[PDB]
Structure 1
């Protein structure tokens, strides 16, 4: 009757706290549990050993937290494994899990984006763990030239540096021009290399900046007006610029650029402004193809050259990557599960974006054949469409179209996806569905999680609870139980969202029972929930003096720094002129979360082909004493 199960992340990372969920379903009294982790397959060393007791007071559920030591035993090219062994009294449940060397994250910050030969590159290396918390470890730093050849190596420790490692490199007067790289990695994990690029070039600061701004970020192929562009020219300090502009347009296919000499226009600059237009006629004439549809998929670039009336200043600016599209929008199903539960609601997470890749706000979307199923995208450009599935093994096909009023059907974005049926144990027709309200979720809000159950009446009464687990930043954040009373189709879980949930998390739930031919059955489901991106704390830089006062060269100024208490704040001041020449590779909080999201062990938005697939897709391993377990994972990265 009793079934002892264990749950761990698909990948166990070194020098990081890992959690293990232990359960004893249909068990009675106190159940002693001992967990040990040995290396595979030799079992030379006992990496970890923990003990716990599963009493009825804890619903026969408890967890074990263990930190695998960075032993020199885990050393080429072959993946390492460990054996997680849990002993529930007499019963022994073991599982082989994949191991990652990745110790944490390394973020590199350079003072500037571009440098001149003979100058010094000041850069900081932030050392943190998987929880983005400051740690003291040995780091290997390599300065790599454009060729890709390292011209300098060094090994340093971040201990007593509060996670901030200040470094510097002197660029020789004689040096190869181009993109230089800064490679860094923890000593323990050489495989995981973090990089940052900085350009080396001979240059002088512009004096004034030029902004090339098209009316629309994109160009509709059937727009008679053509591409309309506004040329903005202003001195770096603010004052507007008076001069003459030289603007030319061109088409880009891949890396092949085609110039449009016919479009070259010389326009005056009045009060730091000017306008130029690329007529559709000139665009079509420039290319040798009558078919305008062919241009779709390519992009346009605008080259502008502003010269002051003094003739002492000249600046070159450009906007490239302007997509030639048939639709202002684009639909993605990347956040939508590819598996559905027949006879249960299927939730689609439509992702609408602009041609540039940015989210689209308040864009109407709906499923063909179901006008009733219309929704509006949130600030993140995501909308939820719920359709009612009928009991069948036939592949589900969904086509989503935008219903943005003011646009014609030809300009509406469209996309089609396919969902496969969730395979049930012995064709019992038992399913589990998790649904979450689609709205921008912030730390401090309460998220209601809906547990929808589907199964024959004969065994429905047996289910008295759901086991849920929360996956964040690649590790188990929380685990609990959701009680259910017989006859309840739906039960709600008031889940509190804290800073720990940033930037996103997966919620996987499951239940077990003995139905049909006395078969032990496990039904599982999972959902991916996105959380508003931001700092766990907060950091702001503002003026500390009256606004009336204007900064004068060589004058004293007061800066107001408001942030977390006891936090170490590193500062830097860069001349905007530098960004005029290069604005690539600038450190932002968003880029940090991007890296964290990449490392995620989960590979799907949710659900799976079967209960086993549900756990694995979420980045989890399930193993029971009876025999139910997830397949082995030997891949460190997610499937393409």
Structure 2
């Protein structure tokens, strides 16, 4: 009956400490256990290439969170890098209490993890997005560790040519976590996109890359932007909406542009074949720098019939509009093109990725949807209708209809109720009217006869910020109240962070303080033992993207306008001593560039931090082992264990 749990992340990143959580379940008050935990290679020999970490547990302290280092030297020593097929290492928890008390066959219990080689973060920056051939390129690369603090490790940068050939390689010994370097593009370089990579010398797969386009150009004077009236066209047989565009020309310094806009229309398929209408062209002057144009239904249908086609064929095609305005009397001409005006049959969209799957019976099932306009910002105030059919539990199926208007950012949380002994649930979601966006989802109930279910309820369905406490309501449904505590844990960025023990009451509430080491998302895994079987549930929370751990405000007090040669006072403020990496860039470079090349902002940093995570899906499982596997854990008590990951990426 007594059991010793063991939790650890599914994937080990060599050279970075491993968060191993041990727990003691159903132990008499008079028993105190002590042992050690270490990594181990199963093939070479039982040679522990990790410093053994001791743990002591008792009735009053039945769990302990240990940090287990995995140094590079020991890991290389045991032949982990000499394995032929399969990068797999084992973690073992050895204690003499197992043999003495449980009389087990052996006193070794553990899991089969899957090591990797990624470590730390590297960020690369270049002087400007687009370069002229034969122009110097200045790039700097910052290096940080997994804790997001500056690192002094050694990287090996390398430039690549447009064809893919290496052009320059270097190795650096950073004492300041920044490396700056210059190189010259060959004068005869053909147009293309060059890539700069940077990886840790020890870690083979710890690379990070940036791209810059090489193209022969002269910096423009003004930018031309084409904006559709709506980002979509309704090709529904009932009706076809109006096609109207606004073309705006603006000098780089703000003043409008006087000139003549020449616009041409055509069809464009996803393959990349353009079919222009020999006609329908527009030639209009610009008033206040903006010109309003439109294509009437009659002329559009005439053009379509002249092309030997009907309006039914406009399924994947998009209307392609090209413009080439000529400034007057300067004479300079600039061109713009639009490749995002799709033909659609529904002006809305539905994203049911937030909705859980295979959820517990006897508790409300929350359907979460994000209604978004076709190629646009999330909608608000658009009614959403859900028809949920609870399939045969033994009798005829029963249907329910619930309608709710989206509040803000498109979020809608519709609590469809589900009875006990449910078989399956079928969900038909329709957003907006007329011309609704329809989505479907089917959920299969867990097999009957289980030891119970755990329901995790979130009273607030909005993304918490940083520094705000979060409350979840744990409850046990369809089970016997024989236990006394709920055990829960948090999983952020692929490593166990928190592990606690909450007493059991009616509607137990747990509070988690959203700190700065939980962003941009975390998994809340809770469970309890109903006799000799685990009952578990999980949940994913997306912390809202906001400010940094520190701060940096570059502010220039005064008006935006200036004059060449003026002196500008630039203020920098932080919370500690920091190496501010400054850079001032022209804006006409973006106009010169054919394709958008977004810079390094907080979105990229947040994606970098959470790319190390092992979680997969919005949470929930048919059993305890499935829940832990979805979360990203490695559980093994003696009778149950999770099979090793087959590949780093979830199916």
Q: In the alignment, which residue of structure 2 is the partner of 1:121?
A: 137
- Cα separation, partners in 2 of 1:347 and 1:131, compared to 1, 3 Å: farther
How many residues are paired up? 616
Q: In the alignment, which residue of structure 2 is the partner of 1:556?
A: 567
Report the Cα offset of residue 529 of structure 1: 0.8
Q: In the alignment, which residue of structure 2 is the partner of 1:417?
A: 441
Q: In the alignment, which residue of structure 1 is the partner of 2:527?
A: 510
Report the Cα offset of residue 439 of structure 1: 0.8
1:470 aligns with 2:473: no
Which structure 2 residues correspond to residues 16-95 of structure 1 after superposition, within 5 A?
16-27=16-27, 28=29, 29-42=31-44, 43-58=46-61, 60-71=62-73, 72=76, 73-75=79-81, 78-91=85-98, 92-95=108-111
**What are the superposed Cα offsets for residues 372-429 of structure 1, whole Å, 9 maximum, x if unpaired?**
64445454433222222223462322122224xxx41x2x2121112222346xx235
1:191 aligns with 2:198: no
Q: TM-score, structure 2 length as denominator? A: 0.89
Q: 1:149 aligns with which of 147, 156, 165?
A: 165
Q: In the alignment, which residue of structure 2 is the partner of 1:360?
A: 379
- Cα separation, partners in 2 of 1:529 and 1:373, compared to 1, 3 Å: farther
Which structure 2 residues correspond to residues 90-239 of structure 1 after superposition, within 5 A?
90-91=97-98, 92-157=108-173, 159-161=174-176, 163-222=177-236, 224-239=240-255
Query: 1:380–1:440: 8 Å Cα contact kept in structure 2?
Result: no
Structure 1 window deviating more from structure 2 (304-313 vs 95-104): it is 304-313
Distance in 2 (alpha carbons) for counterparts of 1:201 and 1:217 = 30
Report the Cα offset of residue 481 of structure 1: 1.5
Report the Cα offset of residue 433 of structure 1: 1.6
- Cα separation, partners in 2 of 1:578 and 1:39, compared to 1, 3 Å: same
**What are the superposed Cα offsets for residues 331-362 of structure 1, whole Å, 9 maximum, x if unpaired?**
12222222221222222221322322653345
Helix, strand or coil for the counterpart of 2:606?
A: helix
Query: 2:34–2:97: 8 Å Cα contact kept in structure 1?
Result: no
- Cα separation, partners in 2 of 1:276 and 1:501, compared to 1, 3 Å: same
Structure 1 window deviating more from structure 2 (567-576 vs 66-75): it is 66-75
Distance in 2 (alpha carbons) for counterparts of 1:138 and 1:378 = 49
Query: 2:383–2:431: 8 Å Cα contact kept in structure 1?
Result: yes
Distance in 2 (alpha carbons) for counterparts of 1:104 and 1:45 = 24
- Cα separation, partners in 2 of 1:566 and 1:78, compared to 1, 3 Å: farther
Query: 2:234–2:241: 8 Å Cα contact kept in structure 1?
Result: no
Report the Cα offset of residue 80 of structure 1: 1.8
Structure 1 window deviating more from structure 2 (490-499 vs 189-198): it is 189-198
Query: 2:537–2:621: 8 Å Cα contact kept in structure 1?
Result: yes
Distance in 2 (alpha carbons) for counterparts of 1:285 and 1:474 = 59
Gaps of 5+ in 2: 99-107, 389-398
Q: 1:480 aligns with which of 500, 513, 524?
A: 500
Which structure 2 residues correspond to residues 475-554 of structure 1 after superposition, within 5 A?
475-485=495-505, 488=506, 490-514=507-531, 520-537=532-549, 539-547=551-559, 550-554=561-565
Report the Cα offset of residue 7 of structure 1: 0.5
Helix, strand or coil for the counterpart of 1:428?
A: coil
Helix, strand or coil for the counterpart of 1:615?
A: helix
Q: In the alignment, which residue of structure 1 is the partner of 2:101?
A: none
- Cα separation, partners in 2 of 1:10 and 1:394, compared to 1, 3 Å: same
Query: 2:233–2:241: 8 Å Cα contact kept in structure 1?
Result: no
Query: 2:465–2:546: 8 Å Cα contact kept in structure 1?
Result: no
- Cα separation, partners in 2 of 1:581 and 1:469, compared to 1, 3 Å: same
| More strand by percentage | 1
Distance in 2 (alpha carbons) for counterparts of 1:168 and 1:493 = 54
**What are the superposed Cα offsets for residues 188-219 of structure 1, whole Å, 9 maximum, x if unpaired?**
23234322211101101110111111121222
Instruction: Output the aligned Cα RMSD.
Output: 2.3
- Cα separation, partners in 2 of 1:562 and 1:319, compared to 1, 3 Å: farther
**What are the superposed Cα offsets for residues 202-257 of structure 1, whole Å, 9 maximum, x if unpaired?**
10111011111112122222564532111111110111111111122333322323
Distance in 1 (alpha carbons) for counterparts of 2:126 and 2:382 = 39
**What are the superposed Cα offsets for residues 440-498 of structure 1, whole Å, 9 maximum, x if unpaired?**
31012121112121124xx22x121211111111111211112113xx2x221122111
Report the Cα offset of residue 304 of structure 1: 1.9
**What are the superposed Cα offsets for residues 63-94 of structure 1, whole Å, 9 maximum, x if unpaired?**
11112112334428843222211134422422
- Cα separation, partners in 2 of 1:483 and 1:89, compared to 1, 3 Å: farther
Distance in 2 (alpha carbons) for counterparts of 1:126 and 1:139 = 10
1:600 aligns with 2:616: no
Query: 1:545–1:557: 8 Å Cα contact kept in structure 2?
Result: no
Distance in 2 (alpha carbons) for counterparts of 1:376 and 1:226 = 27
Distance in 2 (alpha carbons) for counterparts of 1:281 and 1:594 = 48
**What are the superposed Cα offsets for residues 571-607 of structure 1, whole Å, 9 maximum, x if unpaired?**
1111110011223142221122234444421111101
Helix, strand or coil for the counterpart of 2:590?
A: helix
Q: In the alignment, which residue of structure 2 is the partner of 1:431?
A: 453
- Cα separation, partners in 2 of 1:228 and 1:492, compared to 1, 3 Å: same
- Cα separation, partners in 2 of 1:452 and 1:280, compared to 1, 3 Å: farther
Helix, strand or coil for the counterpart of 2:194?
A: strand
Query: 1:379–1:440: 8 Å Cα contact kept in structure 2?
Result: no
Which structure 2 residues correspond to residues 232-247 of structure 1 after superposition, within 5 A?
232-247=248-263
**What are the superposed Cα offsets for residues 149-191 of structure 1, whole Å, 9 maximum, x if unpaired?**
222222223x322x33323321121212111111222222323
Q: In the alignment, which residue of structure 2 is the partner of 1:276?
A: 293
Report the Cα offset of residue 106 of structure 1: 2.1
Query: 1:260–1:286: 8 Å Cα contact kept in structure 2?
Result: no
Report the Cα offset of residue 290 of structure 1: 5.2
- Cα separation, partners in 2 of 1:414 and 1:629, compared to 1, 3 Å: same
1:383 aligns with 2:412: yes
Gaps of 5+ in 1: 515-519
Q: In the alignment, which residue of structure 1 is the partner of 2:601?
A: 588
Query: 2:245–2:292: 8 Å Cα contact kept in structure 1?
Result: yes
Distance in 1 (alpha carbons) for counterparts of 2:272 and 2:118 = 39
- Cα separation, partners in 2 of 1:381 and 1:125, compared to 1, 3 Å: farther
